Design a binder for these strands. Structure first.
Ligand SMILES: *[C][C@@](*)(*)C(*)(*)(*)(*)(O*)(C(*)(*)(*)(=O*)[O@@](*)(*)*)C1(*)(*)(*)=C(*)(*)(*)([C](*)O*)C(*)(*)(*)(=O*)N2(*)(*)(*)[C@@](*)(*)C3(*)(*)(*)=C(*)(*)(*)([N@](*)(*)=C4(*)(*)(*)[C@](*)(*)=C(*)(*)C(*)(*)(*)(O*)=C(*)(*)(*)([C@@](*)(*)N(*)(*)(*)([C]*)[C]*)C4(*)(*)(*)=[C@]3(*)*)C2(*)(*)(*)=[C@@]1(*)*
Length: 494
DNA sequence: AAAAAGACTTGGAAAAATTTTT
DNA sequence: AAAAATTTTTCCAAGTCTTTTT
């Protein structure tokens, strides 16, 4: 029988668990060497590469078809990192990447892909059965009286970094994660997981103030990557329920907050004027609270608080509309945001004052960062941060649009059209793009449907119109939103 | 403070598995 | 059979906000 964690007494703040036991992470499949017939060339002559160098060479060979393997930054980074993985004998022969011929390696990898879909019933069924025994042995964990699923237990294989957009580190080598890089987290009364034969873990800790099971440091950015519980668990779902509850508490406080920031545009001090114009953008246009990145780590992308002077172009009268602000920046994942939006009279006058005596490279809202904006938002409502406005706007627009687009006389397949049409409006507001059915050509429903929309709004909609939840939510989503699907009436109001 | 770390939050695109069209 | 159009898993990062160092 399935566990209804939502009927339980809410888990206390501070300590995340009392008990934790798991079988550790599943390491990336080992490197299968190149056979004798698959040769590498340098200056037209054959050259057998050492195992370490040959492994790095394969990553490039597999990506050879893409246009990014011809870029300055990619090639510079790849070659620099391939030098480290070479022997002193190889370092003296291989001076540049351009005299290297990977074409034969590339052909073998295409040949293996063509040979992988031609497998028998003893190969196609066997590998899918060894994946199932792996899913049941390492894909589950015990955390406080119950067996819950683990998210991504299979650690990512080594390769070359690409990232999203115009990334400075594209082409850098993602190293193979070893047991000696793993920090295991579990309880003192639990059976500490066994490392692969011949190896030992980096650390075995017992921190109950955190929710992760396994952690390590990746080399590209230096940040800690984690292995946590799947979305269907108590620890993730309760936090997901609390996120929506916070957005619901902002609903009965928004009119009071909107009136306050409208008055703040007139204030004597500029520290308050900028804070209010930035909050106006976050409320109206659902922008992300733009944190400050370190120059040269990730692609140059901004958000609301990190907006520069060059990202906006002021127009008093354009297209027959008053006070137009033309936004043109790259948001998260290098997705372009473009909107010609008519603002209030005081907001336009304020933006003119913020763009004065400044160069294009300078920050628009100086004397303001994400911490100052969130410190103020905490003084208005408890637990309020800038991303709560995005959750609020997305969820309320779905509720509003579902009421507006669903009609009583329509059939079940036609009602699904209306749900997806309401979901479309949420994706346009949140700027969730999908690169090139005529409507949803450039729009992506996935991100909002799972991160942004209180699932109870959908469960309420479904029980009202007689649409079974399986027509809206698939197998995996139904498990993530189980709390909502069980506990929720037709009368749910955000 | 205020930089740096740490711990959460937020798929779409490319491939492979099928299914349908020629 | 053989190819094309769909469906569906496999591949791969980047923000937000909190907590620690410097
Ligand atoms: C595409 C879309 C995005 O980007 C946004 O929007 O933001 C995303 C999402 C949504 O929300 C999600 O969810 N996700 C998850 C994940 C991702 N990415 C990635 C990359 C890489 C890797 O490796 C991974 C895995 N790990 C293990 C965690 C991932 C995941 C995203 C995105």
């Amino acid at each position: 029988a399935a566990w209804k964690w939502w009927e339980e007494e809410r888990y206390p703040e501070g300590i995340k668990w009392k008990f934790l036991e798991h079988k550790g992470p599943v390491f990336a499949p080992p490197y299968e060497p190149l056979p004798e017939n698959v040769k590498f060339y340098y200056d037209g002559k054959v050259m057998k590469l050492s195992p370490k160098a040959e492994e790095v060479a394969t990553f490039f060979a597999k990506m050879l078809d893409h246009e990014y393997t011809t870029k300055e930054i990619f090639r510079k980074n790849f070659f620099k990192d391939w030098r480290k993985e070479m022997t002193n004998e190889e370092k003296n022969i291989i001076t540049n990447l351009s005299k290297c011929d990977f074409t034969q390696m590339s052909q073998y990898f295409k040949a293996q892909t063509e040979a992988r879909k031609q497998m028998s019933k003893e190969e196609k069924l066997k590998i899918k059965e060894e994946n199932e025994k792996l899913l049941k042995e390492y894909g589950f964990c015990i955390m406080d009286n119950h067996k819950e699923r683990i998210a991504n237990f299979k650690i990512e294989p080594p390769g070359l970094s690409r990232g999203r957009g115009n990334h400075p580190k594209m082409g850098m080598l993602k190293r193979r994660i070893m047991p000696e890089d793993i920090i295991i987290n579990c309880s003192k009364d639990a059976k500490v997981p066994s490392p692969p034969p011949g190896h030992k873990w980096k650390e075995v800790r017992h921190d109950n103030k955190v929710t992760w099971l396994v952690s390590w440091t990746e080399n590209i950015q230096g940040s800690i990557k984690y292995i946590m519980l799947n979305p269907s668990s108590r620890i993730k779902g309760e936090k997901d329920w609390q996120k929506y509850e916070t957005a619901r508490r902002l609903k009965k406080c928004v009119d009071k907050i909107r009136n306050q920031y409208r008055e703040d545009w007139k204030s004597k001090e500029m520290k308050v004027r900028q804070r209010a114009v930035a909050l106006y953008f976050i409320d109206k246009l659902a922008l992300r609270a733009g944190n400050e990145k370190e120059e040269g780590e990730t692609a140059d992308t901004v958000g609301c608080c990190s907006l520069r002077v060059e990202h906006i172009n002021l127009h008093p009268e354009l297209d027959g509309q008053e006070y137009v602000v033309e936004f043109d920046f790259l948001g998260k994942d290098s997705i372009r945001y473009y909107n010609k939006v008519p603002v209030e009279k005081r907001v336009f006058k304020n933006l003119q004052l913020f763009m004065e005596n400044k160069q294009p490279e300078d920050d628009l809202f100086d004397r303001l960062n994400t911490g100052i904006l969130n410190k103020h938002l905490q003084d208005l409502m408890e637990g309020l941060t800038a991303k709560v406005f995005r959750t609020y706007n997305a969820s309320i627009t779905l509720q509003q649009q579902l009421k507006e687009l669903t009609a009583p006389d329509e059939n079940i397949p036609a009602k699904i059209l209306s749900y997806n049409r309401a979901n479309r409006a949420v994706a346009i507001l949140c700027n969730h793009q999908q690169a090139p059915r005529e409507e949803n050509k450039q729009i992506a429903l996935g991100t909002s449907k799972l991160n942004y929309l209180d699932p109870r709004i959908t469960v309420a909609w479904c029980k009202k119109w007689g649409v079974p939840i399986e027509k809206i939510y698939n197998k995996t989503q139904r498990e993530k939103f189980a709390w909502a699907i069980d506990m929720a009436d037709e009368d749910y109001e955000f």
